[PDB]
Amino acid sequence: VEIVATILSWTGLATPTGVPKDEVLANRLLNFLMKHVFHPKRAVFRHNLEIIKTLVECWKDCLSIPYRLIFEKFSGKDPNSKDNSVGIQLLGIVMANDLPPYDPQCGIQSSEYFQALVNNM
């Protein structure tokens, strides 16, 4: 977290996108950050979400917005435990800036992802 903070601290200077190797490194970076995020102590959960939000807000060009992991996050049934929360918070994170939630370009078809969302509603 300190390395990603000190490298994102200089916008307008050494842009991470456009580099023909750091693109395919940063996608692995972003998917790892989206993977390991939960952390049952509530206080640094918000810091993890803030690091993800600042990352997508600053990079924004090498897109690679990864699906089906949020779908695995919120597709879980049995409405007694809040295991679907991370999917909708992270979808709000990717939605609230830009970048539409278009499913059927890489992941699943659009006709079922929205239904999964409405079904957990």
From Swiss-Prot:
Positions of modified residues (N6-acetyllysine): K73
Organism domain of life: Eukaryota
PTM per Swiss-Prot/TrEMBL: Autophosphorylated at two clusters, the T2609 cluster and the S2056 cluster. Autophosphorylation induces a conformational change that leads to remodeling of the DNA-PK complex, requisite for efficient end processing and DNA repair. S-nitrosylated by GAPDH.
Record-annotated disulphide pairs: none
Subcellular location field: Nucleus; Nucleus, Nucleolus; Cytoplasm, Cytosol
Disease: Immunodeficiency 26 with or without neurologic abnormalities: A form of severe combined immunodeficiency characterized by reduced or absent T and B cells, recurrent candidiasis, and lower respiratory tract infections. Some patients show dysmorphic features, severe growth failure, microcephaly, seizures, and impaired neurological functions.
Subunit structure of this chain's protein: DNA-PK is a heterotrimer of PRKDC and the Ku dimer (composed of XRCC6/Ku70 and XRCC5/Ku86). Formation of this complex may be promoted by interaction with ILF3. Component of the core long-range non-homologous end joining (NHEJ) complex (also named DNA-PK complex) composed of PRKDC, LIG4, XRCC4, XRCC6/Ku70, XRCC5/Ku86 and NHEJ1/XLF. Additional component of the NHEJ complex includes PAXX. Following autophosphorylation, PRKDC dissociates from DNA. Interacts with DNA-PKcs-interacting protein (KIP) with the region upstream the kinase domain.
Described purpose of this protein according to its UniProt entry: Serine/threonine-protein kinase that acts as a molecular sensor for DNA damage. Involved in DNA non-homologous end joining (NHEJ) required for double-strand break (DSB) repair and V(D)J recombination. Must be bound to DNA to express its catalytic properties. Promotes processing of hairpin DNA structures in V(D)J recombination by activation of the hairpin endonuclease artemis (DCLRE1C). Recruited by XRCC5 and XRCC6 to DNA ends and is required to (1) protect and align broken ends of DNA, thereby preventing their degradation, (2) and sequester the DSB for repair by NHEJ.
Recorded family membership: Belongs to the PI3/PI4-kinase family.
Protein name as annotated: DNA-dependent protein kinase catalytic subunit
